Amino acid sequence: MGIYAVMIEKMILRDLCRFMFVYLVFLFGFSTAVVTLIEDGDSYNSLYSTCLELFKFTIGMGDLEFTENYDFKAVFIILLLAYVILTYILLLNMLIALMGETVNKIAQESKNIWKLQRA
Amino acid sequence: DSVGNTVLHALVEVADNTADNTKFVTSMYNEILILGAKLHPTLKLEELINKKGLTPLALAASSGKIGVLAYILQREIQEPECRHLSRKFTEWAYGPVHSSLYDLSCIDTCEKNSVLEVIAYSSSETPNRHDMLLVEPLNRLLQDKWDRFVKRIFYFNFFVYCLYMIVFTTAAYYRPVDGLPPYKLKNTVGDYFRVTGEILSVSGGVYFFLRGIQYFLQRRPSMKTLFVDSYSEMLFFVQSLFMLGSVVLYFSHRKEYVASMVFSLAMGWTNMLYYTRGFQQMGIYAVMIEKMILRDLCRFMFVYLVFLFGFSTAVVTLIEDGDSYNSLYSTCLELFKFTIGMGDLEFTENYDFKAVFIILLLAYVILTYILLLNMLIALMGETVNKIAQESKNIWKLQRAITILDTEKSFLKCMRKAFRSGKLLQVGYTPDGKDDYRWCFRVDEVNWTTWNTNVGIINEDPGNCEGVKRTLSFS
Amino acid sequence: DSVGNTVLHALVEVADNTADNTKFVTSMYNEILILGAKLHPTLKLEELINKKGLTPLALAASSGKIGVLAYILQREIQEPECRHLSRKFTEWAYGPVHSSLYDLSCIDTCEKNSVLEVIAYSSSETPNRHDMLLVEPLNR
Numbered sequence: 001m002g003i004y005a006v007m008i009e010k011m012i013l014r015d016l017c018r019f020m021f022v023y024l025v026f027l028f029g030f031s032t033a034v035v036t037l038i039e040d041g042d043s044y045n046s047l048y049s050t051c052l053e054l055f056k057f058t059i060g061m062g063d064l065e066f067t068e069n070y071d072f073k074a075v076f077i078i079l080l081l082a083y084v085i086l087t088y089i090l091l092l093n094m095l096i097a098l099m100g101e102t103v104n105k106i107a108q109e110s111k112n113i114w115k116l117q118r119a
Numbered sequence: 120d121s122v123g124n125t126v127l128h129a130l131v132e133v134a135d136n137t138a139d140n141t142k143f144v145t146s147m148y149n150e151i152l153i154l155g156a157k158l159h160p161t162l163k164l165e166e167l168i169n170k171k172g173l174t175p176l177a178l179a180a181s182s183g184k185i186g187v188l189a190y191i192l193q194r195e196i197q198e199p200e201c202r203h204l205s206r207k208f209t210e211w212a213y214g215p216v217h218s219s220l221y222d223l224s225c226i227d228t229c230e231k232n233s234v235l236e237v238i239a240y241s242s243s244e245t246p247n248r249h250d251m252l253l254v255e256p257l258n259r260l261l262q263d264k265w266d267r268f269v270k271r272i273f274y275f276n277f278f279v280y281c282l283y284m285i286v287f288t289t290a291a292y293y294r295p296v297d298g299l300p301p302y303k304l305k306n307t308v309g310d311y312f313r314v315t316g317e318i319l320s321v322s323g324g325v326y327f328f329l330r331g332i333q334y335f336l337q338r339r340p341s342m343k344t345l346f347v348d349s350y351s352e353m354l355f356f357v358q359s360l361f362m363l364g365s366v367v368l369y370f371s372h373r374k375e376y377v378a379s380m381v382f383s384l385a386m387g388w389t390n391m392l393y394y395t396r397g398f399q400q401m402g403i404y405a406v407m408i409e410k411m412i413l414r415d416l417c418r419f420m421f422v423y424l425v426f427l428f429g430f431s432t433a434v435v436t437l438i439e440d441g442d443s444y445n446s447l448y449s450t451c452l453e454l455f456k457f458t459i460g461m462g463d464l465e466f467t468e469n470y471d472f473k474a475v476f477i478i479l480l481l482a483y484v485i486l487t488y489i490l491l492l493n494m495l496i497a498l499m500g501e502t503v504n505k506i507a508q509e510s511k512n513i514w515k516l517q518r519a520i521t522i523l524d525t526e527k528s529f530l531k532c533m534r535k536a537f538r539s540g541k542l543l544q545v546g547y548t549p550d551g552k553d554d555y556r557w558c559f560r561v562d563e564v565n566w567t568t569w570n571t572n573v574g575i576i577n578e579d580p581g582n583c584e585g586v587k588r589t590l591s592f593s
Numbered sequence: 594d595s596v597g598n599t600v601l602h603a604l605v606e607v608a609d610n611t612a613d614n615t616k617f618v619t620s621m622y623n624e625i626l627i628l629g630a631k632l633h634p635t636l637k638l639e640e641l642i643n644k645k646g647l648t649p650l651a652l653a654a655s656s657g658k659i660g661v662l663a664y665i666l667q668r669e670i671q672e673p674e675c676r677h678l679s680r681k682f683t684e685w686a687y688g689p690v691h692s693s694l695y696d697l698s699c700i701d702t703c704e705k706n707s708v709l710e711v712i713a714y715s716s717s718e719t720p721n722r723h724d725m726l727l728v729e730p731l732n733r
């Protein structure tokens with residue numbers, strides 16, 4: 001288990017401050033995109049509430065219809081679908097990169113780190 | 120010849136980076152220079168020009184002959200009377216240490232066909248663009264001029280581009296929601312700064328356009344496969360199109376300015392991802408994204424769209440009106456909602472024949488899970504063995520383009536860009552004159568070999584105020 | 594010297610964990626001790642102190658010189674008259690078996706600059722913090 005804790009210590013210092021800066025951009029981008037579009041007439045017009053929805057696609061709750069207060073549907077969908085896609089692109093490389101970069105050797109290093117971290 | 124290629128221009132060309140060639144060509148390339156020195160000691164064979172303009176080194180880097188490009192740069196001719204031709208000279212060598220002076224004459228952005236100008240801006244049809252820039256001098260050459268007088272200018276652009284989009288976003292989120300789009304400035308602190316936000320956005324959006332035009336149908340005139348290889352500069356150009364598209368509609372009294380603006384925004388923040396050409400460990404992660412969206416999306420989506428448009432169409436035919444999820448669109452969308460994590464399985468009871476309606480959806484979910492899986496498996500078994508190396512190598516190139524384009528933003532001055540080497544003398548000509556030549560320094564060490572190699576340039580070791588030359592066969 | 598490093602304090606420092614160095618330094622590090630034994634058999638060269646306080650072993654572990662740190666701990670000088678310097682002694686050896694006595698004088702938490710106090714608490718700038726603790730005695 002000590003091996004498994006040390007991993008967590010080595011993404012939260014090495015492999016989060018990269019990734020989140022990327023994911024926040026798409027989010028703050030494609031969220032901002034939607035907010036500009038939607039016009040008040042519920043009342044999911046705030047940037048906050050909108051940024052939160054596009055976080056809910058990630059975890060597994062995606063409305064795709066979270067407001068019909070939009071003008072111009074086809075814009076409103078292409079973004080969300082372009083957000084989901086790029087997000088799936090982007091959550092994937094968080095997996096690929098970690099493998100091809102270090103899976104060859106973490107079980108050795110992480111074990112070695114544990115013996116120090118016990119020491 | 121009819122093309123103007125000499126002996127040396129051919130030896131470069133005939134190679135194809137294999138071992139036997141590379142072992143071979145470098146040797147014959149050695150001798151003929153030694154002969155051309157001994158026979159006619161004025162002919163600068165490495166400075167003659169074929170009809171296309173390219174010198175041998177230029178041809179080597181252009182066509183992408185890595186093994187030859189190694190030799191031409193980090194040669195070392197110990198033989199006296201023909202030492203002027205060498206490049207990798209060794210100055211002070213205090214025992215295990217030895218400091219070397221990789222020459223720079225035709226590989227810095229001062230000459231016309233500098234290799235580094237060729238290697239980066241050339242087509243992707245040239246094999247081993249990347250591995251050339253991993254040769255010893257060129258690699259360290261860049262990272263230094265990154266660590267001086269580029270990293271500053273680069274981050275400065277990163278600052279400004281952020282300030283662009285924060286303003287652009289700010290114009291948007293406070294856009295007027297009223298009638299038609301000329302919008303007739305009303306007087307208020309907000310609206311004075313609102314229109315300011317508009318102008319700076321447009322006036323900056325057009326900047327990407329013009330600088331984009333400068334890239335496409337001007338310097339680096341690219342073709343269709345080259346447009347997509349040069350991925351970024353499209354996106355910053357495509358951004359300005361929507362933006363310069365938006366402004367048209369804003370004054371054409373048509374409401375659709377918002378649409379064009381929004382697409383422009385979304386790329387624009389997504390475009391800020393581009394300025395991780397600094398910041399190594401993230402630059403590797405951007406380049407991956409550039410290499411599925413060109414190589415591993417146009418495959419996959421064509422597959423996934425089929426199942427979707429198939430199994431969606433299947434459902435639509437079945438369901439009979441009697442809510443009203445009968446349109447193909449609304450149905451195709453539901454089967455997208457299984458993927459992300461919202462699946463009704465019951466999204467209409469307007470079906471006849473339940474058992475059909477379920478077997479499809481379950482057969483869609485399954486095959487989709489089959490299909491999202493192989494998107495993972497294939498990428499591993501195809502390339503996980505080596506992306507961390509390649510992607511890293513791509514980054515060093517993709518930084519190198521940024522460096523060179525930045526140097527050109529400095530017109531010709533080069534005053535802080537002649538790339539240290541300060542005309543260090545490294546010997547004498549083969550007639551008696553001095554041999555001042557630009558030379559990037561490199562410090563090294565070898566514990567097995569002890570560096571008694573002939574060619575020391577400086578008796579007293581080191582680098583300070585006061586240099587003193589050696590009896591290098593004066 | 595101006596820093597107080599002796600011959601041995603230098604041999605540690607000059608290495609960089611490569612093969613040729615490590616093959617090299619351990620050998621020269623061997624001889625000079627054999628000589629310093631044969632010439633002046635009281636000088637405890639491995640117990641002298643640079644101005645920063647660190648003994649050679651301390652410097653080795655500090656700067657993170659794994660190959661040197663191996664040798665200094667699990668040495669074995671078969672040569673008589675200079676056996677006192679060895680650490681990896683062998684007690685009872687009933688044929689294939691042999692029981693060894695890795696010395697501990699400067700690697701347990703009793704002295705000031707014990708390696709194990711240095712290796713763990715030192716900066717991450719010291720390369721191979723981890724691989725040092727995989728040497729034979731320190732691990733077990």
Ligand SMILES: CCCCCCCC/C=C/CCCCCCCC(=O)O[C@@H](COC(=O)CCCCCCCCCCCCCCC)COP(=O)([O-])OCC[N+](C)(C)C
Pocket residue numbers: 017018020021274277278281397398399400401
């Ligand atoms: C309004 C203004 C907007 C900002 C505009 C910025 C303007 C100017 C920008 C300024 C930034 C840097 C200033 C220089 C500081 C150091 C100098 C130096 O040594 O050079 C170093 C620069 O330093 C780095 O590389 C630091 C690592 C940055 C990681 C990316 C940003 C974090 C985003 C997190 C967001 C997530 C938030 C939380 C998520 C939940 C380079 O040396 P190195 O050896 O290459 O460093 C290796 C580190 N590396 C591997 C990471 C690359």
Ligand SMILES: COc1cc(CNC(=O)CCCC/C=C\C(C)C)ccc1O
Pocket residue numbers: 078079082086350351352354355382385386389390391392393394405406408409
């Ligand atoms: C330029 O820097 C980079 C940018 C990107 C992201 N690519 C994109 O811009 C495409 C995705 C943006 C959304 C598209 C659809 C609109 C119409 C809503 C990847 C690598 C990079 O280096």
Ligand code: NA
Pocket residue numbers: 059060459460
């Ligand atoms: Na899920």
